[PDB]
Every structure is written in structure tokens, then in C-alpha cells.
Short mmCIF file of C-alpha atoms and ligand atoms in Angstrom, two decimals:
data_model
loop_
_atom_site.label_atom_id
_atom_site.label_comp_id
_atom_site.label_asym_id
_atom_site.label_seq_id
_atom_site.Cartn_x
_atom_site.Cartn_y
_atom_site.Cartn_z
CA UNK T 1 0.00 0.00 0.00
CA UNK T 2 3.05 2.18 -0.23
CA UNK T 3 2.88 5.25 -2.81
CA UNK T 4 5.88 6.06 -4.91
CA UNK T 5 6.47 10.07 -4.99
CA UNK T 6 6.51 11.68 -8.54
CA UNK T 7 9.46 13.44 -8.90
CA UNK T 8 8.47 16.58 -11.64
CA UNK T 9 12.21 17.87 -12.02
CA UNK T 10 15.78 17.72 -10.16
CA UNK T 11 18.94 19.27 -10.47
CA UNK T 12 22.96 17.78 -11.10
CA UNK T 13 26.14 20.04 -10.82
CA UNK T 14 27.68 17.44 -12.69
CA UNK T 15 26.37 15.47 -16.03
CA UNK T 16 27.58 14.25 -19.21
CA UNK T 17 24.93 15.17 -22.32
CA UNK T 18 22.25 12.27 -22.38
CA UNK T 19 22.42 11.56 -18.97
CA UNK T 20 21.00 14.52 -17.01
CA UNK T 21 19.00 13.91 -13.79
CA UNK T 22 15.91 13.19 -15.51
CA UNK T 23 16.93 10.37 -16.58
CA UNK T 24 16.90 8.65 -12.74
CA UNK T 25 13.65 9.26 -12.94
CA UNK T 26 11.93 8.34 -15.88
CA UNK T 27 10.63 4.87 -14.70
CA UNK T 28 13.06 2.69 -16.72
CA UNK T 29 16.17 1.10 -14.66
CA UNK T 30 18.35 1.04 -18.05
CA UNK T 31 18.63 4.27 -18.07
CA UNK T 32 20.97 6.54 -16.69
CA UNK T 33 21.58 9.67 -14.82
CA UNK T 34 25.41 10.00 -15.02
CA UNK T 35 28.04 12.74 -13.80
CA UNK T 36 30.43 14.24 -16.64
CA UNK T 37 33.01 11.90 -17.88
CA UNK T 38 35.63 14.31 -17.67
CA UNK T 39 36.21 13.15 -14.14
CA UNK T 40 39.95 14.49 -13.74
CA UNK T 41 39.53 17.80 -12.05
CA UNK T 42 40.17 17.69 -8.19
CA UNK T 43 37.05 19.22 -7.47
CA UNK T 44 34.72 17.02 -9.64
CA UNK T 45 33.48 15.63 -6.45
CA UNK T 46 31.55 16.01 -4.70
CA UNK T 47 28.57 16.12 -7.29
CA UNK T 48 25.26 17.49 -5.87
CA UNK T 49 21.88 15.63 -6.92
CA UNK T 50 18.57 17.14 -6.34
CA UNK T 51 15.08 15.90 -6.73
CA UNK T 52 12.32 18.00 -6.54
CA UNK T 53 8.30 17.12 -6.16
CA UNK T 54 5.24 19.21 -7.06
CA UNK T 55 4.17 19.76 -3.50
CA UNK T 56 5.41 19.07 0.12
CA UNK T 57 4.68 15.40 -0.34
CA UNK T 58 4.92 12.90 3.15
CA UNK T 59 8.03 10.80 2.51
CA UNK T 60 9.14 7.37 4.48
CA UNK T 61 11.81 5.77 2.62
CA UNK T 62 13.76 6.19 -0.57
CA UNK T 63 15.36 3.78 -2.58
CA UNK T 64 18.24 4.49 -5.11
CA UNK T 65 19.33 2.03 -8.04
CA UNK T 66 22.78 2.01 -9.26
CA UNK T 67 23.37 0.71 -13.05
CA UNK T 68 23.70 -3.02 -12.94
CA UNK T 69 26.15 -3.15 -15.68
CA UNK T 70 29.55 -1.58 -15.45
CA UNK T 71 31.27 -0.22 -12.53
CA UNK T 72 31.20 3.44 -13.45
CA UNK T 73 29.37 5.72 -10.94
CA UNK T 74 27.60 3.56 -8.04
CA UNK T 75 27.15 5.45 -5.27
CA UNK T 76 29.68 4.97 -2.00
CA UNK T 77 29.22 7.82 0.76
CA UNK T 78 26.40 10.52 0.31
CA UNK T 79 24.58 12.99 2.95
CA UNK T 80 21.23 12.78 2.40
CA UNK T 81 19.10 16.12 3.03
CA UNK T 82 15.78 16.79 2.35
CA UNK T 83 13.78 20.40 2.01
CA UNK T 84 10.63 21.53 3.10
CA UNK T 85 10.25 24.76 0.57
CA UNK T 86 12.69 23.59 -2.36
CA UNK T 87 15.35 26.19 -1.15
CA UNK T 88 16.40 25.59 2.30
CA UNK T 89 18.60 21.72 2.88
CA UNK T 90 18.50 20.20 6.09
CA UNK T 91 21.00 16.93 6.79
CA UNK T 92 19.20 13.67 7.17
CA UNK T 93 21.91 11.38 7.30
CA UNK T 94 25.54 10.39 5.87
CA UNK T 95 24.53 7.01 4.24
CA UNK T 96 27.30 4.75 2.37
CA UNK T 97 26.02 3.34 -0.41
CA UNK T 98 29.26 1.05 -0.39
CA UNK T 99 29.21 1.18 -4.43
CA UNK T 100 26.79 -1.72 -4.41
CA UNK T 101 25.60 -3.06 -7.38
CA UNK T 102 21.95 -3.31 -6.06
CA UNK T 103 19.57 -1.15 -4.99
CA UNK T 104 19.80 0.80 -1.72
CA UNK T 105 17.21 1.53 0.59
CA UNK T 106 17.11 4.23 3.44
CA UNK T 107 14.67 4.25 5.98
CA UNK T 108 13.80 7.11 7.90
CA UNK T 109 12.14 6.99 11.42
CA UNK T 110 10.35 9.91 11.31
CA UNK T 111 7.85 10.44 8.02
CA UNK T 112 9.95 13.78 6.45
CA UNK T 113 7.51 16.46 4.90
CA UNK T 114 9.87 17.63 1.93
CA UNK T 115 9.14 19.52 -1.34
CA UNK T 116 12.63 17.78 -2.35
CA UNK T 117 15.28 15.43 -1.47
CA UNK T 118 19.13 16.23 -1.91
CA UNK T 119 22.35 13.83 -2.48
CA UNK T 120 25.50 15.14 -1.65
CA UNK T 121 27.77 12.27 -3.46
CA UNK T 122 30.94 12.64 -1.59
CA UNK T 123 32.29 9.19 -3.69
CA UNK T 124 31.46 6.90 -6.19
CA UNK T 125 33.01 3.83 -7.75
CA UNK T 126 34.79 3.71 -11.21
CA UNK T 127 37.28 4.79 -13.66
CA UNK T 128 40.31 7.15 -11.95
CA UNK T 129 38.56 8.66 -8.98
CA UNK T 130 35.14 7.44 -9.83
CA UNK T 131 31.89 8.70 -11.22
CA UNK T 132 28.23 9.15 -9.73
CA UNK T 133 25.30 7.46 -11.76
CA UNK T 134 22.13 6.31 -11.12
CA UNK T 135 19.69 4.19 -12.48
CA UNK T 136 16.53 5.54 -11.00
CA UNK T 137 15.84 7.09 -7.94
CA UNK T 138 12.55 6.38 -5.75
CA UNK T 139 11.08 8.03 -3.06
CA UNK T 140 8.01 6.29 -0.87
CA UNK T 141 5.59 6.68 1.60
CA UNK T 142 3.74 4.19 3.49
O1 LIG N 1 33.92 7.24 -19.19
C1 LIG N 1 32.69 7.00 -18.51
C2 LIG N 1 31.78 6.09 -19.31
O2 LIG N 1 32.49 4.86 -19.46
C3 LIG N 1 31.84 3.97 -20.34
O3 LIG N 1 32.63 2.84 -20.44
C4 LIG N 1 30.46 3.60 -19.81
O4 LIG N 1 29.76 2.83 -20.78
C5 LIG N 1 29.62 4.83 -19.51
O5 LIG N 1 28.45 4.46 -18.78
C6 LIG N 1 30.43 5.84 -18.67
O6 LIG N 1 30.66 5.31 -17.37
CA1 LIG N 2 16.30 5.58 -15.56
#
């Protein structure tokens, strides 16, 4: 009985062309949001995700889908915020996605009210000093 969040738009301070946020959520796990592949700067990360609803929307748990093939981009540690108003971040939590290859859930123990959610991607596995991609992004509530 849980109901999956639409996510209207979101935000990435890093992409390469064909891969902007959108494409985390568009519903198909093939497809993927990636950061830039010019990943040699020494400020690439960390790369700031954002994903924004159409309304403050009640939100319980999120799951986020790396790609399932090649290594380029899962996730390892992120701090998780979420907004009330779209503007203004507050911290959740520091999760480590631990560049799994499968999808990662975070449960919250408190139901967050949040126009958007926010992924600070400190790290993520790949090529040189990594990437950050993602295959879809979901956000619930029970
Ligand atoms: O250079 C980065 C790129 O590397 C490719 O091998 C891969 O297919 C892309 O998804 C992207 O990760
Ligand atoms: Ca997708």
C-alpha cells in the first residue's frame, strides 16, 4: 500500500549530455543519470543531486538504483538532506552506499515532509577517482 512520490524535475552540478537527472527518474532502470566523464579535475566531487516534487509530499523511505552493468558511478558515501520549501537543505543522514551493485534503501524513522530530497555524493566507484550514476531514484511513503 506504499505510494511512490513523482518526482516533476531535479537538479545535477555534474552530467555528461544524455544523462542529465531526468533520466533517474523516468521509470526505466536502463537508463541513466550520469556525472560528466571528464572526471579528472580535483574538485569534480563532490557532485550534488537534487530531486524536486510538485508539493510538500509525506516521505518514508527512498530507494536508489545504481546501473547493474559496469562499474562506473555507483554510489559509495552521500549525505542525504531533504527540504521543506525547495530552497532551504537540512542533513538527514551520511549514508554509504558502499558502491553496491543493487539497490539501496534508506529508511527514515520519522515520516519527512519535503518539497525535495538532496544527495551530496561525496564518492562513487569507477574509472580514476570514480563517477556518480544512477539508475533511478525512488522516493516512498507508506
Ligand atoms: O567514461 C565514462 C563512461 O564509461 C563507459 O565505459 C560507460 O559505458 C559509460 O556508462 C560511462 O561510465
Ligand atoms: Ca532511468
Amino acid at each position: 500500500g506504499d505510494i511512490k512520490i513523482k518526482i516533476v524535475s531535479g537538479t545535477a552540478s555534474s552530467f555528461q549530455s544524455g544523462s542529465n537527472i531526468e533520466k533517474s527518474f523516468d521509470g526505466d532502470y536502463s537508463t541513466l543519470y550520469h556525472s560528466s566523464w571528464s572526471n579528472g579535475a580535483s574538485n569534480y566531487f563532490p557532485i550534488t543531486l537534487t530531486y524536486n516534487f510538485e508539493t510538500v509530499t509525506d516521505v518514508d523511505y527512498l530507494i536508489y538504483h545504481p546501473r547493474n552493468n559496469g562499474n562506473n558511478g555507483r554510489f559509495k558515501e552521500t549525505e542525504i538532506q531533504y527540504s521543506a520549501d525547495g530552497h532551504t537543505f537540512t542533513k538527514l543522514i551520511d549514508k554509504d552506499f558502499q558502491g553496491s551493485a543493487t539497490a539501496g534503501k534508506v529508511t527514515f524513522d520519522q515520516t519527512i515532509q519535503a518539497k525535495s530530497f538532496r544527495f551530496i555524493v561525496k564518492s562513487g566507484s569507477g574509472d580514476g577517482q570514480g563517477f556518480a550514476s544512477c539508475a533511478e531514484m525512488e522516493f516512498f511513503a507508506k
